[PDB]
């Protein structure tokens, strides 16, 4: 997250760190949202590589013991069947991870609330992106979870020529684009949390930014629209 502020420890308890094994250690690669005690929602592109993944819940600082973390292996990865790694702009950037164990819920570990199917946010709706992604274009990961205020940019505006043009689809949510604040590498797969009827729900799964840079004016961060996938998500959980 570029232009973020450090999140409070208990603000976003559904945020997870998706990590891969790297030598004798683990490296953060993407975010995710805990949606069941044994299921995480993340981006398909985060799990294209043939790597060993684990999920950390209750995480705040990647580099220090918080006293709240639970670590769990990923047992099954279900990518959206229309996902194509060669074509992020086509959409379908979403995957579900079944965890090897069910995690324990507490102040630091909660299920993310998903929007009702088909819900579309009004232009300029208040949302926050969270994650440990780069804090600058071509920078380094955050140590502590960051948040940034990123208001939505509706489809009509987002798909206009000076924004994303044809690259953005109605199955996506755009947010931000102010040139200061944005998602960035390492935030992929994590949540966009938007306040609706007094309750935050996870309306986006972070998908992509401009090849030009993370915080680029009129290139808002682009997210998979969770509410386009409610049936898919329920179907996967039900059959697994």
């Amino acid at each position: 997250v570029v232009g973020g502020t450090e999140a409070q420890r208990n603000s976003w308890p559904s945020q997870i760190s998706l990590q891969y094994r790297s030598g004798s250690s683990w490296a953060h690669t993407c975010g995710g949202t805990l949606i069941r005690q044994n299921w995480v929602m993340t981006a398909a592109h985060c799990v294209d590589r043939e790597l060993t993944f684990r999920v950390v819940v209750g995480e705040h600082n990647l580099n220090q013991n918080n006293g709240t973390e639970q670590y769990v292996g990923v047992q099954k990865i279900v990518v959206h069947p229309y996902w194509n790694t060669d074509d992020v702009a086509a959409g379908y950037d979403i995957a579900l991870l079944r965890l090897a164990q069910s995690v324990t819920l507490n102040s630091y570990v909660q299920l993310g609330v998903l929007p009702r199917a088909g819900t579309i946010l009004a232009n300029n709706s208040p949302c926050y992106i969270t994650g440990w992604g780069l804090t600058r274009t071509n920078g380094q990961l955050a140590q502590t979870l960051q948040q940034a205020y990123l208001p939505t940019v509706d489809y009509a505006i987002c798909s206009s020529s000076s924004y994303w043009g044809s690259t953005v689809k109605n199955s996506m949510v755009c947010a931000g684009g102010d040139g200061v604040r944005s998602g960035c590498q390492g935030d992929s797969g994590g949540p966009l949390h938007c306040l609706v009827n007094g309750q935050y729900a996870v309306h986006g799964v972070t998908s992509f930014v401009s090849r030009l840079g993370c915080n680029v004016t009129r290139k808002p961060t682009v997210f998979t629209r969770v509410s386009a996938y409610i049936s898919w998500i329920n179907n996967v959980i039900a059959s697994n």
Binding site: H28, T29, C30, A43, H45, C46, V88, A89, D93, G133, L141, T167, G183, C184, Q185, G186, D187, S188, G189, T206, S207, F208, V209, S210, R211, C214, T221, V222
Partner: peptide, 6 residues
């Protein structure tokens, strides 16, 4: 389009 990701 740059996935972000990591």
């Amino acid at each position: 389009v740059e996935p972000i990701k990591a």
